[PDB]
Structure formats: C-alpha cells, structure tokens
Amino acid sequence: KLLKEQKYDRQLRLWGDHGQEALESAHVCLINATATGTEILKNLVLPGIGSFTIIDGNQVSGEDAGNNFFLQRSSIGKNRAEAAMEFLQELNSDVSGSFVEESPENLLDNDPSFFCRFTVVVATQLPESTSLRLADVLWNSQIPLLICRTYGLVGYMRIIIKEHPVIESHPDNALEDLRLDKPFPELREHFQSYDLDHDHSHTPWIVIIAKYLAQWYSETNGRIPKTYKEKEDFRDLIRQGILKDEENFEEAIKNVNTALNTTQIPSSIEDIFNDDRCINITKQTPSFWILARALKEFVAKEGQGNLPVRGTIPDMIADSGKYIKLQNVYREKAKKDAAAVGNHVAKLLQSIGQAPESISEKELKLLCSNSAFLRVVRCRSLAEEYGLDTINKDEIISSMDNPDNEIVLYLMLRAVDRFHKQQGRYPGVSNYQVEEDIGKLKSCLTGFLQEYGLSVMVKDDYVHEFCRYGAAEPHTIAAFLGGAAAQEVIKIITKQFVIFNNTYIYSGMSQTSATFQL
C-alpha cells in the first residue's frame, strides 16, 4: 500500500496521486509480443498500468527469441503471446496480465467488439491490411489506437484518437499571470497600502514596478510603455530610486521585459472557445467542453475579457510577510474567480438537464489554474490518411523539398507494404534476394507514388537501404520506439500531457525524428 508509494515515487513527482490512479485503473491491449510490442509493454507494466492483455497468434521463432528480452530459448515453439506475458508479469506483481492465443485478423473477424473493453489499444508490426481494418473498427467504437512498427532503423508511430482534450497540459514555461496591466480591486488596494518612500530591498519586486508604473501613468496621462525605447526609459525610472545598491530594485528592472504585458487570452484558448463543440452544447457534450464553455461565459461576464486568475506568483526576493500577504491577494481572486466559473457550470449543466454536481470541485479548481493551458488534439482517422481523395499531399510534397526529410522513410514504408501486398513477402529478407528485389521495390514505390499522384524525387539511395533491412526488428530501434510509445499511452490514460499529432517518424540511422499530420 504505502509500499507502492515508495516504489512509484520518482513518477508521482510527475503525474501525481491522481495520475497514478488513472494508470492503475487502465487496461492496455498489446497486439504483438514482438520486440517492439514487448518493449512498450515493459514501460507501462513498470510504472503500474492496472492490467494488460496480449493478443498474438504467432509461435516464438528462433529470431523471435534472439531480440526479445522477454522471450527465452525455451520459449521457441510456444505461443509468442503467452510466453512474453510470463516474463513481463515478473516486472511488477501489482500488474495483472492476460493473453489471447488468437490472431488480430482472427478476432476482428469473429468477436469484433472484444476491443471495447480496453482503455487504449497498442498494435505492433502489423501488415497494412490488418491496420486498415482494425483502425476502422476501433475508430467506430471510440477507442484510442496506437500503431507502432519497427523496420530496419526506421521508427513508425501512428496515434489515432478522434478527440483528446486536456486540462493539465504541463507547460515547461509560461508568462506569469501577474495582472499589472489590468490590476483587480483587491490587488490595487494592496499596492496602495504601501509607500515608495516610507524595506528598501524587502518589498516584493512586484509592489515595486506597481508603484513606479502607477507614477509613470500620471507623467504621460496613463500610458503603458510599449515601444522598446519607452520600456528602456521606464527601466531607468526605477533605477532612480535605489537609495544608494539593492537586489530587488535591480531585479524589477529586468521584470520589465515581461511584467508589463502578461494578460492576453491565448490563441489556443480562443480556438477552443470558438470551436463548435463549445458553442453548441447538448447532453452528449463531455464535461471537457462544458467547462470550456463556463470559462467562455466567464470571460464574458465576471471575467471581463479575461480568464480566471491563476492564483499564483513566482519567487521574488522580499520579506516573509509582504510576500505571503501579497500571495493571498491572488490566492483569493483565484478562489473567487473560480467560484464564478463554478456558477456558469452549474447553470450550464441545467440548461442541458444533467445533475448540478456532475462536475466535482477538484475538477473546477484544476480547470481554473490551467485555463490558459488547455489543449485539444484531434487526429485524422487512418482511413482518411489512406484515401485517394483525402491524402494530405501538400504535407508530403512540402517535406520532400528535402531529399532526406523523414517523410521519405514513410513513403518507403508504404512502398514496402505495397510490395508485401504484392509478393506476399517483404523486400530482401533472405540474403540472396536483396539483389533482385532492389528493382521490384523501386517499381512498387513508383507505383504507389502514382496511385496518389505524388510528383516527388525519392533518392535511389533509400530504395537500397530498405532492402538491406530485410524487414529486421533491431532491438535498439524497437527499444527507442517502445520508450516513446509508452509515454504517449501514459498520456492518453492520464490525460496529462500533450500527445504528438499524427505520425512520428524515427531514423535511427541519422538519429533524427519528425512529426507529420497525415
């Protein structure tokens, strides 16, 4: 119990108690106990994923056993799924494992709704047809899907979630919500309760720029420094006050390059606001959008063109009483600003017909403090990516202006798949084939480029390389993918960070990666 807390400590410092809950309640589905799939599962089972299930029709082969850290020599001959599951199981006794000795195709064929029991489905080393089919089935069931394939030194990763909205986007950096440009009642009363002459270096750097900006606002008829030249001057205006060498005074002098303009509803929040899912609410509108509306309504009424106050301020070299009392100035607007957003939610849930307390207060508070960091990611279904009429040519062609842009590796993968659809085998698996196939692969590429009318130059260098690969699954590449992939699953499950948009390509041969929107 409080034994787990000791084991998962380095991560709770990342997604917290609540993140750990979503995780410990999730049930992941892995499509193949290949090295790539096994690596991904390894990274989910360790942090605590509630339970998992492995679907795998294949038998463990010699090479299967040579590049898997979760399959042994004895495993050869046995069902790849069941075998892998036995060692993964040993990684964390708090995780419950399961396996289905059936094939994806076999399942998609009989029980088509087996996958509805899963939080997220991760499919690996899957042939084109199987992907398209599963992609379709899962898309119409509203089930997240992550397609990962290792080929030579190439990493392919395709996420497919119709809509994935998030409150805790965990931004690395972000301007503070100080409110100097648009100070609120309680805040101003504070700034006035002080005196710039009657503590020389114990006054918050904020109360400084405040009273020295309140001054300039009278020596030019309340105008805010906007031109750099103007800001530079406002700097020296505070310089002339350091009755002497002061740290905070000389500190406020750098805060000027920010503390002036911090208030401004961001683009991202704007688009959410103007999104139809926000403007048009019904009883199907997920809580995410109802809160995005309450924020909208807020900004209109109590908000005054602005989002609720964050409620937090940075560290500023100052007194141990001036700082804390200054902090409640915000900790209070925040609470009151949130209570208002909490009203808009109440009313809102009513014009719909849902119970007034269908959205907890914990949610609300988390919502308000993160209001500026909302993110909504929507991924084009796979079927659209593969469509003749819907392909995203522009994206492809544009990237191709660089003969070495990762996208070639994607195009090449489609060629290799067309090739597999044709020969019933991948390009150059045996050593004597590498020769002859270099040609057959080139024809397949050029044939794929036509069906879609993509007039791009693919170096002949890349057509060789992919035959050298012989559809190999180099553990270290698999291991990289396994790493990247699992954290995105963690994201979907916790709804705590921002998932890459469409496709992530990895070149282990140049050690570079890119994300596209196919």
């Binding site: 040579g66 009483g321 050298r468 998932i499």
Partner: protein, 431 residues
Amino acid sequence: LDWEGRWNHVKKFLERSGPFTHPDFEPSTESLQFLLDTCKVLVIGAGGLGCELLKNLALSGFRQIHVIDMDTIDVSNLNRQFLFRPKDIGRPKAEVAAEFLNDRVPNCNVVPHFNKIQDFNDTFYRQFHIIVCGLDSIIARRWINGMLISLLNYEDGVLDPSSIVPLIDGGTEGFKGNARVILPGMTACIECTLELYPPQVNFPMATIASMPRLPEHCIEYVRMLQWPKEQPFGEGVPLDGDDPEHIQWIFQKSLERASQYNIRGVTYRLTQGVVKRIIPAVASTNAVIAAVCATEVFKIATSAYIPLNNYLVFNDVDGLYTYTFEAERKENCPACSQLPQNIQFSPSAKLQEVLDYLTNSASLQMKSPAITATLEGKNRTLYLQSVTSIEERTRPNLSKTLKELGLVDGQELAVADVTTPQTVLFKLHFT
C-alpha cells in the same frame, strides 16, 4: 551453442553492405563472431540508463561487457530499473544487474565492478573499445571525460587515432533527456560544452534563516541549520537522506517552522525532495535515450552506419521533439586542447585572485583546485584544499603576488581539481 536464427536481426547490417554504410565498413560473414568475442565495452552506471543500456548492448551482439556502479538497490529505483526485484533491495546494483543479464541473455558475460569510477586508473580504461555513460552527476562526467582524454598520446603533434576510446554518454531528467557521442580529442568533450547545463538554484542564507516564503525554505532550514544545532538522533550523527525516521523528523519540524510564518505546501513528498534534491524519473525517457546511445555504440564497433555527430536532445512533454546538432569543439578547452591555456594576468595579481578565476569562471568551474608552479626545480605547492593539513600550511600564499612568489612570465602552472584526473596546464601571461 547458439540456436538457428538467434542474430538475424543483427546480421543484416554486418552480412550486407549498403548506401549509408561507413567508409570503413566491409560486408563479412565473420564480423558478428568477432564482435561477440573481442569487443570490450564498459557501461558506466547501473541505474536506469545503465539498466536499459546493458539489455540493448546484450541483444545487439555485444557479449564482453563490464559495468561499474558504487550504489545499492533502493526501493525507489524499482519503477524504472527493471533488473532489480524488491527481493534484491540492499544488494549492489552492478552485481544484481550483471547477474540478471548473464541469466536472461544466454551467453552474455557482463562483469560487475562494485566501484566508484575514480577507484580505477588509466591502466583500467585502456582495456576498452567503448565507454557508455549513464551517470547521475556532472562531476562524474567531467572526471570520466578527463580520464579518456588523458589516454590520448600525440606522436609529435599528430594524434594517434588508436589512442581514442569513443565515449557515449546519455542524460535524463523527467521527459527531457539527451544522448551524445564524444571522440576524445576530435569531437567536442564534456568540458567543451560544460555551459549547456542548467543554473544552480541555491536559496540564500538570508531567506532561509529569517525570510521564509516558500515551503522549501522551511525544509531547507530544518535540514541545513536546525538539524546540526539540535542533533536529534545523537551528536555527530548526520542525517541519512534515506532514513524514513530522519526525514520524518525534518518533516515534522518543517511543518512547525512553517506555521511560525504561515506557509502551506509542507508535505512529506516535498520534504524528501528538497533534502535529497530528487529528480523526477520514469522508465520511458531512460529507455529512449539509452536506445539511442546503445545504437551509436553499435555503429562505432561495426561501422554499419555513420555515428551520430555530436548532440541529440529529446522532449516528451509536448508531442515528441528531437533536435540533433553538432557541438563546436572549443579549440581552447582546458580539457581536450592540445597545449596550455594562455591565461592573462597583470603582474600585480594577488593570488587568491587565481583561485577565483578557475573557481568561478563559467568556461571551466573548479570545485576545489590547487595550483603548483616551478621555482627551483623545487615544485612549490602554492595553495591547496585537498589535505586539511597542507591547506593551512599554504593558506597565507593567497596574498603574495606572482613574482612575489618567484613567478616569471611565459612559464606554466598546474591545477588539479576533484573534477578531473588529468593535470590541467596554464602558460601564464603578464601584459
């Protein structure tokens, strides 16, 4: 022996040539056997990066592998270091890590080294064809870095290429992390980039001892001032950052030394963090960086492709981003440069003013250096902080000027810090 198919995934890059191959590469049916038999690799660190690195190398074709680590398995590692079971707690990582692999992967032959990297000397490191890194501190990287550089011998200006033991080091921290490839004496060294590291967050004594605002200052107090002056658990006895009891006390005291100033945010979770300066960690990010490092090592030993040049940064907080660039090798680095660093000091210089150009200069910090020049064939040990004794029997020298200590122009000096094994030089200049 090995079973049919065991290394097919690895064979395709040694048995077959191709367009992205390296100029030295040569398709061979015999190269795999060679790599399993003769390639000595030394992983450095057995906690996460290290754990992931061993597996990767192991399944990549390397058999002759050594691991070094001075630590012991702690429960807080179990969420990312998959080579350790809770039953292994208390045991030494290098040993348990080696044991797991020698068992999980058929004929691997990892050799543990329950040691600090400073225990060994250059005799040791020459044994290896490659050094992979997964350290947990900067000083450690600066040290192993100096070590590898002090293994290079230049036959009259020209650097002997076979005196270069390639160095691959990875870094991690939350969802951000970075891999890297060094070729001691050619590519940029750990010191050539020393300034890419984040600033150091030190809470000024004024705000901890009197002006406590954050909940961390309340903890930093209980741990840095209140523990010494009221040696809770017996005099002399220091606080064990891993003692659930010690911490518990700091915590309890932090709660109080917080209310006295009305501050909230005092939790046990935060207490352990401040006290130990804990870094958030997860399996995934380590797995990534290490997969990268692993792959590079493979290229450098087989020449199946070209070694990543220099850097690679990776962030997983917003989608997946990775910038790859080529770090400039400062041709004036105190570490990998060819000759002494021409330092500039007017003859008036004091002396404690040199112990501060090295100590505080961004270009090359020094934790606690010691200068020593030559006056009468007799090598004067000007200042020092290594041995408490000599420290006093030298401290006064931090006042007499250069020539006021027999320091002519043109002649060099000698500094040696706990940050590097090699003796860094400096051709003093008056102007």
